[PDB]
Design a protein around this ligand. Sequence first.
Ligand SMILES: Nc1ncnc2c1ncn2[C@@H]1O[C@H](CSCC[C@H](N)C(=O)O)[C@@H](O)[C@H]1O
Ligand SMILES: Nc1ncnc2c1ncn2[C@@H]1O[C@H](CSCC[C@H](N)C(=O)O)[C@@H](O)[C@H]1O
Lengths: 266, 266
Amino acid sequence: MQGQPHQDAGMPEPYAATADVYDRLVDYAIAEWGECPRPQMADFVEQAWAARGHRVRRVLELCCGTGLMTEQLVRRGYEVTAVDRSETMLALAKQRVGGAADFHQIELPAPLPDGADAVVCTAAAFNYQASARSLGETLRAVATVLPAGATFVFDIETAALLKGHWGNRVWAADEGDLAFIWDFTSEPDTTYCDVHYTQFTRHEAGADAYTGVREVHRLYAFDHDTVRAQARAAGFAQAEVFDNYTERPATDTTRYETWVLTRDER
Amino acid sequence: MQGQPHQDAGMPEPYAATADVYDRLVDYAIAEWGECPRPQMADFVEQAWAARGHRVRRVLELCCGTGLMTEQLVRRGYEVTAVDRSETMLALAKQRVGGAADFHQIELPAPLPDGADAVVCTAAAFNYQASARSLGETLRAVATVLPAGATFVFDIETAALLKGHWGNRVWAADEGDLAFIWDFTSEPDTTYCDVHYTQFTRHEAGADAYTGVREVHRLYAFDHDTVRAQARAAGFAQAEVFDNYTERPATDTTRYETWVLTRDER
Ligand SMILES: Nc1ncnc2c1ncn2[C@@H]1O[C@H](CSCC[C@H](N)C(=O)O)[C@@H](O)[C@H]1O
Ligand SMILES: Nc1ncnc2c1ncn2[C@@H]1O[C@H](CSCC[C@H](N)C(=O)O)[C@@H](O)[C@H]1O
């Protein structure tokens, strides 16, 4: 996976070993750090479409993961195409949604399936973009399949958090059947934070045996000037930034920034 | 163990399951949180004795643990008596020091061996005292064996930390062969913090099997007025408080307070 630490043989790529705990860790993130529940994310994007008079029918979802946002869009009656680089994540998305969405294994940046009325990318997937250059190339791929005036909504963890909050701190929990640790490290003059994730899964209740699994996730911070510059060059001169899928403009307490990009029109 | 959470059958008392990782966790605490290395603790207590003209020969050490402070005192030529409630901790202290100190298994408060010229209690052992009442009873036991003008030096984690720092936060580390989590919880109107400690010990390098162990430690906060009141009632009207085994008076950044109590004289 481009942009992730070079590591030994048999070391998992992000989500290659942890896909089967992802939904549980999302429930934890919602309860602990303020990650937005998917129904609210879907309410927000629908409100954004309605406020522009967009008769959105076809939605392209990037980095769909296990399909938590995909299922909201499918339930609401959209014709959903959903893409992700991870075969383990996609297998869970297919279990959740079945044939009600069209799934593709694609590593961004790469050409995207044509025909959408709107594009979404939820839950900080864009923090895996390896560079401002790659981010711009991914935004170009989106612009290619969106008509003038159409919208792309995505969220990222705010740049300071990957350097000054989580920054170099540690979080963990012991839930008995599973214990997990996130150890964040960010070197002085880099734009990224390495998250060393470790988990221990109990073999059986009432016994003390566990299996340990580790994954390293490199997360890149993008400041507002970089997002705006790459968006403009990609064909989204208009970009706005909100606080975590609410209509409140982003402020200094925002942890998850929701960017609403509008495709250039005439 | 009085003052510790009532828990199920087969749940370890403090240090009953973790004595064999204690020295390693002290090395971690020294590196991570600023716990004072034992040679410096010993330098500080010796400087305090010299500043009073005390020809200290016999030292009583309370809550000696695995003997890290005991070994400093023995090396420096003192005649050391050392006591602790924990058979697992004392077995490690005897491995370290052998017959060069006189060890007793005693749970404080209780009568102490007579004859000391000075008493010490290092590394926050007094935060296990179950109440201000118990603390006072332990101080009385010390006063009983100390002559007029003699000193008792002990340290405690500062009251605010057990309510406002560690307070309700989490710390953890994954070191490969051992991973550990401290999960601190402190209810609104209590004077104590429960530390849920969990560790996972690797069976062998190059394999993913671990064994999990948990211990719960209830730590009590004592404010300055309480320490001073119980010390006075016990026969130590003079009490002074320093920052972590330096000659600097305690301040608002002090995490480990070093109390120097002087036995009443005429
Ligand atoms: N360059 C890239 N191309 C495609 N998928 C990517 C990617 N970088 C990261 N991902 C995917 O981004 C996801 C991040 S987790 C977010 C999942 C989902 N959007 C949700 O709302 O829960 C993972 O499934 C990961 O495999
Ligand atoms: N009431 C009590 N009576 C005796 N020992 C006690 C006690 N409460 C706690 N302890 C002991 O206090 C120790 C705390 S760890 C500190 C060990 C040592 N003084 C050092 O400098 O490293 C443990 O060994 C524990 O068993």
